Amino acid sequence: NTVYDPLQLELDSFKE
Amino acid sequence: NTVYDPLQLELDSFKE
């Protein structure tokens, strides 16, 4: 089951 | 009362 990292998901936003 | 999120603050320092 996918474990969601709340940080990597936010980081992509800054660098698209 | 403002709750301070560390990651969001630093997400700015690296941006600028």
UniProtKB/Swiss-Prot annotation, chains A, B:
It comes from Severe acute respiratory syndrome coronavirus 2. This is Spike protein S2'. Subunit of the fusion protein that is processed upon entry into the host cell. Mediates fusion of the virion and cellular membranes by functioning as a class I viral fusion protein. Contains a viral fusion peptide that is unmasked after S2 cleavage. This cleavage can occur at the cell membrane by host TMPRSS2 or during endocytosis by host CSTL. In either case, this triggers an extensive and irreversible conformational change that leads to fusion of the viral envelope with the cellular cytoplasmic membrane, releasing viral genomic RNA into the host cell cytoplasm. It comes from the Viruses.
